[PDB]
Amino acid sequence: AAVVGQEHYDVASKVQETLQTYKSLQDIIAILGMDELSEQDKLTVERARKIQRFLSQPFAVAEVFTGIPGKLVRLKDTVASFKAVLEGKYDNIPEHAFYMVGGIEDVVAKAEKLAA
Amino acid sequence: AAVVGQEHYDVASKVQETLQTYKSLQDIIAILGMDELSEQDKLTVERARKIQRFLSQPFAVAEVFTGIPGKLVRLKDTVASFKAVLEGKYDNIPEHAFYMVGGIEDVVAKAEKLAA
Amino acid sequence: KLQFALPHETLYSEVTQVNLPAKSGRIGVLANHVPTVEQLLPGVVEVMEGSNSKKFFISGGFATVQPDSQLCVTAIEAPLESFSENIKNLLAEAKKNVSSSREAAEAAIQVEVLENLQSV
Amino acid sequence: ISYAAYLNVAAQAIRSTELQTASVLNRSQTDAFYTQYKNASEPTPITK
Amino acid sequence: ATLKEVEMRLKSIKNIEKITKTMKIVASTRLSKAEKAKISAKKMDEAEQLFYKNAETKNKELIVAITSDKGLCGSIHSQLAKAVRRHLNDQPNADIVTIGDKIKMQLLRTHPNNIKLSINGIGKDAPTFQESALIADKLLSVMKAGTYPKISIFYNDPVSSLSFEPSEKPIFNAKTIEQSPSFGKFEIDTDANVPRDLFEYTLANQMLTAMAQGYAAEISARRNAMDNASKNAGDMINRYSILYNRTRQAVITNELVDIITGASS
Amino acid sequence: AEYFRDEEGQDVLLFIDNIFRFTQAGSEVSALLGRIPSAVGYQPTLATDMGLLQERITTTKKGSVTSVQAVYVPADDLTDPAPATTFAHLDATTVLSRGISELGIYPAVDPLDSKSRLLD
Amino acid sequence: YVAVGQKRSTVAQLVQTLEQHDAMKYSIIVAATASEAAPLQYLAPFTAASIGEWFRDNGKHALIVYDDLSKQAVAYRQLSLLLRRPPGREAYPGDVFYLHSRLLERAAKLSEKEGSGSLTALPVIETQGGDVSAYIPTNVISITDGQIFLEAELFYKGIRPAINVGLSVSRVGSAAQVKALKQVAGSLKLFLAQYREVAAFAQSDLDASTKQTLVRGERLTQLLKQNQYSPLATEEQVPLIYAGVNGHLDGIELSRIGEFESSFLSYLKSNHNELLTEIREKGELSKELLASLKSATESFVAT
Amino acid sequence: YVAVGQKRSTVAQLVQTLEQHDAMKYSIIVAATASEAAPLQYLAPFTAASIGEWFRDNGKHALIVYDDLSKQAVAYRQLSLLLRRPPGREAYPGDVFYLHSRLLERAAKLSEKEGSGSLTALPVIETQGGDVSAYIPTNVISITDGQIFLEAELFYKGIRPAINVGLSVSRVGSAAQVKALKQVAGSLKLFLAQYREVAAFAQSDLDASTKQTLVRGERLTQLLKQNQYSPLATEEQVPLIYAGVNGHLDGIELSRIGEFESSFLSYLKSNHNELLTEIREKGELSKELLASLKSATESFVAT
Amino acid sequence: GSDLDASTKQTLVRGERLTQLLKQNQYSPLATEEQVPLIYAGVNGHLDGIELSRIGEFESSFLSYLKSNHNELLTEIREKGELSKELLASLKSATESFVAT
């Protein structure tokens, strides 16, 4: 929290917690099925599946592989963009509109694209 | 298939597949019950239980040890027997009926014995 | 005797006089009474066992004097005091609703309930 | 529409002063969809 | 390798065990409320039934059956399915109304022709008058229930706290009510709409009770099943534990032998 | 103990601490002696060394030693050779438990868990 | 009785037990206790088998119990390791197979030429941690003919001793049996491997046929049970098995099975020990003996 | 602090952190860095202990933290194998137990003859994957009395520092812990024990008792989080645990627990740092202090 | 699982067909020219509708059908070794036509 600032730290703690919860709940969802897992849990899970695919982001040297031109986003910008996800302002955005794209702006654009 | 006839190979393929399903569902069978298996699967499981029991064929040199007279079953007869079982033709009879007896004709006859 | 019973309650599942609002107007059942089956209209109900009286606001139901002097009253949900001002406000809105929209009958029933409530 | 549907509406009306409890409120709010089936065939799961 | 693949599998079994324990307890918790409800409901039912008995109400047809959306609540689904099938040999052309998905799937396979009305969203909640009333209202309007002068409903009677026997009962049509003889030993006006009302009222009252009886059996079955699950899982813990211990020892020994062989050279 | 038994005739009781650490000490001495270690590391002379220790404890005409040993089972594996060899020598096992002690029972001894071959 | 690797105290109690049952006079004891040195233990079964062979080579019938060969394995292991021969699997030396096999095959029913010698071998294997796939045990199993696996769960669970019969085989055993004890016991092994199946799937719907099998099976299991140092005569065993086979233990409620056994035996002797004498000498059941037993068993069942 | 096999950069960071908190002026760092040779590594904990002896002998007190003996083991392996000493379990030297035991017993709380010059010690052992079965861990666990078992899941779950107290023990126990803190944390042990048992629930209908445990338990767990490199005084240990014991924290929402902690402390400092200092100096919670404190906690809870 | 999404069961239905599609008869290799149609059909979900059991029969027949009618198309797939918009459409149409076998 000193090295990368309190905001970065807090944001990252929230991401980590969200994911750790998701993994912990993953077993429960596996057998029991997601239904009796809380409304709060559902929002956390929904964010986690989205965050999981928000991490995804093509690379230029995987035009060889994926065939998608690379995207590299500034660190400061990334902190902001992930912050947005946690705030849940984009929890109306489809999961696949987070998949394999860059920044929040791109996610929004891909939401519009998928919408069309 | 070429070597021992396509029909034999097809029959054998189905037996292998069926038994593999049964092996696969060994986990579910133990962890849960049998009723918690899907109905479609439950038919397969019942068939497979029959197939396993069908495979026990007394040996003549072991006739003493088993206490059951041995059974020598023709290759053509064997193919017939499995063919039927896969089509569930005679399936509707005890798994004890299938147990320790020779060919399909013997199974059919032993069903009468058990039925009494 | 008497059974005043409901799915989620068994109020008075002895009882001497019961005063009921019924399709036959208002009915009182006292000791031996003729063996009847009458659907209770939406209601203000008083049940008296001795002189002591308990007052229920009742969603209507059915009433049946049984020939064994068991007054089976069955209704969906009742205390009068629990039912009964804010409700009068809501019902006013519901009266408006009949104007716009089976729903006409539903809102009409709500107006009937408002009359019954006004009785309370 | 049925006589008991009338009574149903009345019961719902009866859960309207303010002295109410959750179990009462729950008894008058429920979610379901009657999927009118047909002869395989099946008109949609239209909300009850 | 062996050791790690054993270890993860044993861990899986452990997680299953923990879940089956947790679930079983929660099932017990849910069961207490369920039973409480069923008493009050049943008491109400008995009062109406008192009329029907004293009336001696007597008797295409309808078959109504109930088994929740949710599963893993014993053999409620399939014992009821078997008993529906039995009574579907009593009239092949009877119209089956399936209240909840689980019974819907099984019967739909057995005859898909007969599935006419079905209801979703049942399994989620513990039975309520609101549900029963609407299902009934729709049974009358949609299925024109009165046309079929035989109505019969199936449910699971929770016979004992460890048992459930699938059960059926006959819902009394207005025609039955009309022509029952000791209907005449009760009295109300001829200008009353009471046959047509009384039919409707007990269509729902019986149905709510049937649902309540079923629900209690369902939650009870889930408790029983999850308990039996804990036992089955425990046995698997023990079997893999012995495997784990043996495997662990074997690895130590085999590796050691290699080290020794190297030193010996 | 043997001076007590043989030369004072007394019946005496000799406590030992971890016999796991008896085994551990022995395994090391073998390894130092350069002998090829036997299964699960333990000395090749595991059986004989324990054998000498637990056959010098007995009821002679003169007296009898009796020995209480503490078995610190490694990894709680009763399949492990160090426990196994111990269990061969043992006649009875007294199984103290903390669950039982938490029931307020002092003796700490868990009665069902304890098993004896001296109970016959 | 070869006692290898056993507490010298315990062996002395055993010896005293044998002398209590006055059995010492018909028996030899070879002893190689836990205290006794590992090379002595290595040579201990072999020497014992030599002693047995003198009787055998008189043509006389004999028996040798090698208790416990599992302790011989540990001994040969120690010896091998101290001879720094390469450690085999599970640290049991690579020549361990040869050790057991050379020992085991020196016992046998000789031919008429050799004066029909016999040395009955019963080698007693101690499964470490009850591992029935352990290297030394599997190696022994392959050498030996039949195994008499005993089940710990059953031992704790109310049979002392508890002879599991599911995992007990005897490769050629049935040909040496008395014809009576083949006839009365006909298919009872099969029946109780139907009981095994029945109780496998009992834990579920039960057909009345299945219930009948279960009732016979459970009750038969009770009948098998016996308590340590209480043996039964060959003659005595024949009717008891006849009863159970002939389903007379459906006739006895589970609680009273023990009563049935003792009472039945007392009854049989009192009713007619003539029958038992016949089964003792004839050693087979004629049609008359079968009927006489059917009649007699029915007679006891009534009382 | 005995830095064994640690990157010189890492130890430089340690030095810097220590300098940052101005702790070098009672700190001693025996340094055997990752690059440093295996003889130096072998003798490094021994050497460190010797430094400690001077303090201990002088009757003063000290704390020696051996970090990490797991790397001491590897170095001993390197020495032994290269010296062609016979290998042993897990390719660790045979006398590795002997090494560890020699080191670990030199820590001591002397007799009153020697003025009880303590030499508290805290060895650190690194678990390969939580493999307590591993030879070097098993040995050390036996040698030491007490364990602290940190848990990775907890770390991820934001309990930083993460101590899994299910697997932590202190055999020293009540010999340590101030009387005041013992009083107000006996309750804490029992509550937490329940929270662990009631951790299984996390699903429908959850009993009020269970729910009371869950709420109280979650708040307690939240209370025990600590910002690394910020320690808290005993006079602040006592209020915080007291609140938790009194269930005064149970009401406070989870997000506000953290805020509650610092605020409560400042509130206590403003309102009555007399109480805190009194608690500190008495070291035993007087009923009058528990009274005043109870009032104070309530007062803070209200705000 | 105590609940199965319709979407997951769409996947499940498609997936099952794909597994059957993958299978190939031992000692019988198959030309790439005739692997391009089959994979197109599968990926464009044509086979999803076609029942699971008869996928193998369908595969055999489909090839025969393309050999009969769209042998011009097959020649192009071979010849150009890439698929143009037009060729993809031709192929798409052909597949659509054979969905109704």
Coordinates of N, CA and C in Angstrom, one line a residue, chain I residues 36-47 70 73-74 83-100:
Chain I
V36 N -12.9 -30.8 -44.8 CA -13.4 -29.5 -44.8 C -14.9 -29.4 -44.8
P37 N -15.7 -30.2 -45.6 CA -17.2 -30.0 -45.5 C -17.7 -30.4 -44.2
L38 N -17.2 -31.6 -43.6 CA -17.7 -32.1 -42.4 C -17.6 -31.2 -41.2
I39 N -16.4 -30.6 -41.1 CA -16.1 -29.6 -40.1 C -16.9 -28.4 -40.2
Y40 N -17.2 -28.0 -41.5 CA -18.0 -26.8 -41.7 C -19.4 -27.0 -41.2
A41 N -19.9 -28.2 -41.5 CA -21.2 -28.7 -41.1 C -21.4 -28.7 -39.7
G42 N -20.4 -29.2 -39.0 CA -20.4 -29.3 -37.5 C -20.4 -28.0 -36.9
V43 N -19.4 -27.1 -37.3 CA -19.2 -25.9 -36.7 C -20.3 -24.9 -37.0
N44 N -21.0 -25.1 -38.1 CA -22.1 -24.3 -38.5 C -23.4 -24.9 -38.0
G45 N -23.3 -25.9 -37.0 CA -24.3 -26.3 -36.1 C -25.4 -27.1 -36.8
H46 N -25.1 -27.5 -38.1 CA -26.1 -28.2 -38.9 C -26.3 -29.6 -38.3
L47 N -25.2 -30.2 -37.8 CA -25.2 -31.5 -37.2 C -25.8 -31.5 -35.8
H70 N -22.0 -32.0 -55.4 CA -21.1 -30.9 -55.3 C -19.7 -31.4 -55.4
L73 N -17.7 -28.4 -56.2 CA -17.3 -27.7 -55.0 C -16.1 -28.3 -54.3
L74 N -16.1 -29.7 -54.3 CA -15.0 -30.4 -53.7 C -13.7 -30.2 -54.4
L83 N -11.2 -21.1 -48.7 CA -12.6 -21.0 -49.0 C -12.9 -19.5 -49.1
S84 N -13.4 -19.1 -50.3 CA -13.8 -17.8 -50.5 C -15.2 -17.5 -49.9
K85 N -15.7 -16.3 -50.0 CA -17.0 -16.0 -49.5 C -18.0 -16.8 -50.3
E86 N -17.9 -16.9 -51.6 CA -18.8 -17.6 -52.5 C -18.7 -19.1 -52.2
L87 N -17.5 -19.6 -52.1 CA -17.3 -21.1 -51.8 C -17.9 -21.5 -50.5
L88 N -17.8 -20.6 -49.5 CA -18.3 -20.8 -48.2 C -19.8 -20.8 -48.3
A89 N -20.4 -19.9 -49.1 CA -21.8 -19.9 -49.3 C -22.3 -21.0 -50.0
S90 N -21.6 -21.5 -51.1 CA -21.9 -22.7 -51.9 C -22.0 -23.9 -51.0
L91 N -21.0 -24.0 -50.2 CA -20.8 -25.1 -49.2 C -21.9 -25.0 -48.2
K92 N -22.2 -23.7 -47.7 CA -23.2 -23.5 -46.7 C -24.6 -24.0 -47.2
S93 N -24.9 -23.6 -48.4 CA -26.1 -24.0 -49.1 C -26.2 -25.4 -49.3
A94 N -25.1 -26.1 -49.6 CA -25.1 -27.5 -49.9 C -25.4 -28.3 -48.6
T95 N -24.8 -27.8 -47.5 CA -24.9 -28.4 -46.2 C -26.4 -28.2 -45.7
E96 N -27.0 -27.0 -46.0 CA -28.3 -26.7 -45.6 C -29.3 -27.7 -46.2
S97 N -29.0 -27.9 -47.5 CA -29.7 -28.8 -48.4 C -29.7 -30.2 -47.9
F98 N -28.6 -30.6 -47.2 CA -28.5 -32.0 -46.9 C -28.9 -32.2 -45.5
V99 N -29.3 -31.1 -44.7 CA -29.7 -31.2 -43.4 C -31.0 -32.0 -43.4
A100 N -31.8 -31.6 -44.4 CA -32.9 -32.5 -44.8 C -32.2 -33.4 -45.7

